[PDB]
């Protein structure tokens, strides 16, 4: 599990639960390669996007569906989503976890890089 | 106009208007001594705080009301205010804005320095 | 000025300046027509990036070229950059500002939005 | 584990390790009582630091040592620390994660606040 997302409610103070992400891959023709996606579980994670052997070096773009969420909870965002644009391993593979706090009218990101 | 404060509203997209603002330094003798105080304008901001003679070299608590403010606007909020410690003007006066962005379940601060 | 866009540095506590801005619109053929664009002033804030009768209804999409910017400052982030996605004057016009907040492993975007 | 509490380091983009945290409780007295401490782990979480039948309804304050963080990676930061006020289990007892993410002129921090 080289990457994973996580999503919190910054109104609610809870975990963002049954979020779409979207994660895409800059392809060689400069265009964006679909790659994985899922939704997030009761605690706000999504795991088992992707595996080692095909995380590979690269551009990627993760996507999260913020624009669904905030109006399935009554409300009607600002943003259509979250935008998480990054190379990866380009150092050796690391696990990446992709945390995203979200708000009506802002979102912060924060990309926790370890080593095994 | 050596130290300001601006707040924005994160799920309302807007500034903050009408939070109050508490400045306090630290004391001699360990305690915090009320330096200065106000309420955000209609852009949020609050000016006039304090003066180049009076803003000596120090520990400065600025601490936001936002427990009164979500409330005040239909809500409930999580945290009883924002608080912000830092040391001013160790190495000469700079102008200090403190910015913050607000949730009823998260908040961030930011320290903007400038020289004159 | 219906659309302004500011950055600010989370390590330096300043201005982030001569920041690139690319303002993206999503194309009727549902893909991303370039909109405008320029570099952050002194202020970290750019203006004059369109006009109200140029800035129409739409989706959006702010990209804020990040990672030019640490690596300039003799650093080497994360990101490839900040991205912004968002609808524009589905209830009238607005003015907005994106503002930015960066560090090398994690951002924060919030939109202003006021009336006129 | 009624109460938790989470630092991350959004310039490294990884968890703060060995970072201090001072935990109060509001003194009937209107003063600040020491409640709980520790350092935070190599996953930059702090567990155990009280129990359920230690953690009664209240306001407390959780204070996040940033300063002595940064100088040990070769930083000199702006904050003196980071300060969560916050009213506890008004409602019956939650768990409590706090969250930080530090940069050396700003900081966010987030309550994850959970039913059985």
Redo the contacts between chains.
């Keep these: 599990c080289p990457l994973m997302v996580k999503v919190?409610?910054?109104?609610?103070?809870?975990?963002a639960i049954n979020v779409a992400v979207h994660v895409f891959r800059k392809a060689a023709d400069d265009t964006w390669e679909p790659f994985a996606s899922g939704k997030t579980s009761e605690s706000g994670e999504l795991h088992g996007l992707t595996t080692e052997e095909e995380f590979v070096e690269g551009?990627y773009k993760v996507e999260i569906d913020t624009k669904s969420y905030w109006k399935a909870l009554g409300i009607s965002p600002?943003?259509?989503?979250?935008?998480?644009?990054?190379?990866a391993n380009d150092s050796g593979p690391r696990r990446y976890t992709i945390?995203a706090?979200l708000?009506?009218?802002?979102?912060?990101?924060?990309?926790?890089?370890?080593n095994p």
Tied chains: 1, 2, 3, 4.
């Design positions: 919190l409610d910054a109104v609610r103070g809870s975990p551009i600002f943003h259509e989503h979250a935008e998480v644009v990054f190379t945390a706090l708000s009506p009218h802002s979102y912060s990101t924060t990309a926790v890089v370890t």
